Design an enzyme around this catalytic site. Structure first.
Site, PDB file in Angstrom:
ATOM      1  N   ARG A 168      20.451  56.542  21.606  1.00  0.00           N
ATOM      2  CA  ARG A 168      19.621  57.070  20.537  1.00  0.00           C
ATOM      3  C   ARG A 168      18.155  56.765  20.903  1.00  0.00           C
ATOM      4  O   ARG A 168      17.233  57.423  20.426  1.00  0.00           O
ATOM      5  CB  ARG A 168      20.002  56.440  19.196  1.00  0.00           C
ATOM      6  CG  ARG A 168      19.056  56.805  18.059  1.00  0.00           C
ATOM      7  CD  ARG A 168      19.629  56.471  16.669  1.00  0.00           C
ATOM      8  NE  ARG A 168      18.561  56.111  15.727  1.00  0.00           N
ATOM      9  CZ  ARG A 168      18.742  55.798  14.446  1.00  0.00           C
ATOM     10  NH1 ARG A 168      19.959  55.799  13.916  1.00  0.00           N
ATOM     11  NH2 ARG A 168      17.699  55.465  13.690  1.00  0.00           N
ATOM     12  N   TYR A 200      21.653  52.489  22.524  1.00  0.00           N
ATOM     13  CA  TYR A 200      20.841  52.789  23.675  1.00  0.00           C
ATOM     14  C   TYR A 200      20.568  54.264  23.840  1.00  0.00           C
ATOM     15  O   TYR A 200      19.436  54.633  24.119  1.00  0.00           O
ATOM     16  CB  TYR A 200      21.475  52.256  24.955  1.00  0.00           C
ATOM     17  CG  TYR A 200      21.296  50.777  25.184  1.00  0.00           C
ATOM     18  CD1 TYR A 200      20.028  50.214  25.266  1.00  0.00           C
ATOM     19  CD2 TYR A 200      22.396  49.955  25.417  1.00  0.00           C
ATOM     20  CE1 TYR A 200      19.865  48.867  25.586  1.00  0.00           C
ATOM     21  CE2 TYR A 200      22.241  48.610  25.745  1.00  0.00           C
ATOM     22  CZ  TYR A 200      20.975  48.075  25.835  1.00  0.00           C
ATOM     23  OH  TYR A 200      20.823  46.769  26.244  1.00  0.00           O
TER      24      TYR A 200
HETATM   25  C1  ACO Z   1      21.865  45.164  29.220  1.00  0.00           C
HETATM   26  C2  ACO Z   1      22.914  44.766  28.035  1.00  0.00           C
HETATM   27  O1  ACO Z   1      22.984  43.468  28.205  1.00  0.00           O
HETATM   28  S1  ACO Z   1      23.604  45.679  27.026  1.00  0.00           S
HETATM   29  C3  ACO Z   1      24.619  44.462  26.017  1.00  0.00           C
HETATM   30  C4  ACO Z   1      23.947  44.492  24.634  1.00  0.00           C
HETATM   31  N1  ACO Z   1      24.650  43.540  23.768  1.00  0.00           N
HETATM   32  C5  ACO Z   1      25.711  43.594  22.984  1.00  0.00           C
HETATM   33  O2  ACO Z   1      26.365  44.670  22.867  1.00  0.00           O
HETATM   34  C6  ACO Z   1      26.105  42.340  22.239  1.00  0.00           C
HETATM   35  C7  ACO Z   1      26.375  42.572  20.731  1.00  0.00           C
HETATM   36  N2  ACO Z   1      25.288  43.273  20.011  1.00  0.00           N
HETATM   37  C8  ACO Z   1      24.071  42.717  19.710  1.00  0.00           C
HETATM   38  O3  ACO Z   1      23.804  41.575  20.024  1.00  0.00           O
HETATM   39  C9  ACO Z   1      23.071  43.634  18.947  1.00  0.00           C
HETATM   40  O4  ACO Z   1      23.802  44.508  18.125  1.00  0.00           O
HETATM   41  C10 ACO Z   1      22.115  44.458  19.895  1.00  0.00           C
HETATM   42  C11 ACO Z   1      21.290  43.518  20.807  1.00  0.00           C
HETATM   43  C12 ACO Z   1      22.955  45.458  20.765  1.00  0.00           C
HETATM   44  C13 ACO Z   1      21.228  45.305  19.024  1.00  0.00           C
HETATM   45  O5  ACO Z   1      20.332  44.490  18.165  1.00  0.00           O
HETATM   46  P1  ACO Z   1      20.264  44.555  16.599  1.00  0.00           P
HETATM   47  O6  ACO Z   1      19.209  43.643  16.135  1.00  0.00           O
HETATM   48  O7  ACO Z   1      21.594  44.428  15.987  1.00  0.00           O
HETATM   49  O8  ACO Z   1      20.017  45.981  16.120  1.00  0.00           O
HETATM   50  P2  ACO Z   1      18.853  46.681  15.266  1.00  0.00           P
HETATM   51  O9  ACO Z   1      18.881  46.001  13.980  1.00  0.00           O
HETATM   52  O10 ACO Z   1      17.514  47.027  15.913  1.00  0.00           O
HETATM   53  O11 ACO Z   1      19.681  47.990  15.083  1.00  0.00           O
HETATM   54  C14 ACO Z   1      19.498  49.315  15.422  1.00  0.00           C
HETATM   55  C15 ACO Z   1      20.676  49.992  14.729  1.00  0.00           C
HETATM   56  O12 ACO Z   1      20.792  49.337  13.400  1.00  0.00           O
HETATM   57  C16 ACO Z   1      20.401  50.112  12.290  1.00  0.00           C
HETATM   58  N3  ACO Z   1      19.274  49.456  11.629  1.00  0.00           N
HETATM   59  C17 ACO Z   1      18.111  48.988  12.209  1.00  0.00           C
HETATM   60  N4  ACO Z   1      17.271  48.436  11.393  1.00  0.00           N
HETATM   61  C18 ACO Z   1      17.887  48.523  10.151  1.00  0.00           C
HETATM   62  C19 ACO Z   1      17.465  48.086   8.822  1.00  0.00           C
HETATM   63  N5  ACO Z   1      16.285  47.472   8.622  1.00  0.00           N
HETATM   64  N6  ACO Z   1      18.313  48.332   7.802  1.00  0.00           N
HETATM   65  C20 ACO Z   1      19.486  48.946   7.994  1.00  0.00           C
HETATM   66  N7  ACO Z   1      19.979  49.396   9.205  1.00  0.00           N
HETATM   67  C21 ACO Z   1      19.117  49.153  10.277  1.00  0.00           C
HETATM   68  C22 ACO Z   1      19.963  51.464  12.889  1.00  0.00           C
HETATM   69  O13 ACO Z   1      20.610  52.569  12.174  1.00  0.00           O
HETATM   70  C23 ACO Z   1      20.299  51.396  14.392  1.00  0.00           C
HETATM   71  O14 ACO Z   1      21.389  52.275  14.548  1.00  0.00           O
HETATM   72  P3  ACO Z   1      21.749  53.080  15.839  1.00  0.00           P
HETATM   73  O15 ACO Z   1      22.082  52.122  16.913  1.00  0.00           O
HETATM   74  O16 ACO Z   1      22.888  53.891  15.451  1.00  0.00           O
HETATM   75  O17 ACO Z   1      20.506  53.850  16.062  1.00  0.00           O
END
Ligand code: ACO
Ligand code: ACO
Lengths: 167, 167
Positions: A139, A137
């Protein structure tokens, strides 16, 4: 993958994803909402929540045969001082589908929803121990919100609402 | 007195009461919402907030000639585990009109709104130092809500929303 608004047909998937989040947080038994609840609260003539879902090609369905691997649940709120806000309530992507860019895309979609609706900000809660999500978040421009300290959150449950309603 | 849903005509009064609350909290400059904002956000074809107002007989108008002496601003929210909630955002009665039963009646009205909408609970924030309001609320069934601790509240403001929206 595809990020799209949910449809009444996805309710099953939303409930399943809501339960995965609860289990990830070790509180699955807390979910008492039913599929029927979501259909009614979300696709009735007046939605109490909006949802975006991440759909993957059938070739990459989950072992359980599900194309929906992520979601974001939100609603609009209001601040008497600044106006409209987009409040992100739940945000979750299934383990095996993270780090692919799905969450980033969901957040992009929400941001557009916020601008289209002329909300001045998006608010949301993150567990204090969740550094990975905090970093994610922050970032993307997130900052701490201090509007709630010095304040206590209270609730008045149905029992008392009914009493007050009928006194 | 009379407790009734606000009308587009009361926007002037709502903004005035919102500013009195802000001044009571020593943050009046924080209110940047305009009357035009309220009319649009509250009586447009889709309300982002609902409001109840307390109207007194013209004989007892405020020195400024206002019949509206109190209000409650709320909206519905959603909890993925239990469903619909009524969220009370602002609640205020002008000094000279307190201790008359207006606030109690507003809360009664809200409770009915909550039951009619099948909300399982009403949530709201109270400043920690405000024992009078804490007592008021707890005498009417309120209890502490612990769902937020261990959590940090974040915001992503318009600047970053726009950036994310257009990347
Ligand atoms: C209001 C709230 O409810 S906040 C609670 C949020 N939920 C949670 O914490 C529950 C557990 N986590 C999750 O479900 C997920 O990890 C989420 C929803 C937080 C994020 O969604 P995701 O689809 O995993 O992440 P996404 O793939 O867009 O990732 C972004 C991160 O992954 C990496 N990444 C993104 N795309 C790629 C890719 N194509 N290849 C390699 N790495 C990648 C980035 O480096 C980025 O890193 P950063 O966070 O350090 O900048
Ligand atoms: C979600 C939130 O926003 S919480 C923030 C709430 N706001 C504030 O604290 C701002 C400042 N306070 C106010 O604006 C008001 O005092 C409110 C909104 C809290 C309450 O509304 P009011 O109209 O003053 O109160 P109301 O008249 O119904 O009073 C109930 C109390 O007054 C007394 N009272 C009520 N009616 C009468 C009456 N007819 N004669 C004498 N005493 C009375 C009761 O003993 C009751 O006491 P209790 O709280 O100890 O039970």
């Amino acid at each position: 993958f595809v990020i799209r608004p949910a449809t009444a047909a996805d309710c099953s998937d939303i409930l399943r994803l809501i339960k995965e989040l609860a289990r990830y947080e070790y509180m699955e038994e807390q979910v008492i909402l039913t599929e029927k609840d979501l259909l009614e609260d979300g696709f009735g003539e007046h939605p109490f929540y909006h949802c975006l879902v991440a759909e993957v090609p059938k070739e990459h369905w989950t072992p359980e045969g599900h194309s929906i691997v992520g979601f974001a649940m939100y609603y609009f709120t209001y601040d008497p001082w600044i106006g409209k806000l987009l409040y992100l309530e739940d945000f979750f992507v299934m383990s095996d589908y993270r780090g692919f860019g799905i969450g980033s895309e969901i957040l992009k979609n929400l941001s557009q929803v916020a601008m289209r609706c002329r909300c001045s900000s998006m608010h949301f809660l993150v567990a204090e121990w969740n550094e990975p999500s905090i970093n994610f978040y922050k970032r993307r421009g997130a900052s701490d919100l201090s509007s709630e300290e010095g304040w206590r959150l209270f609730k008045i449950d149905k029992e008392y609402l009914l009493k007050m309603a009928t006194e």
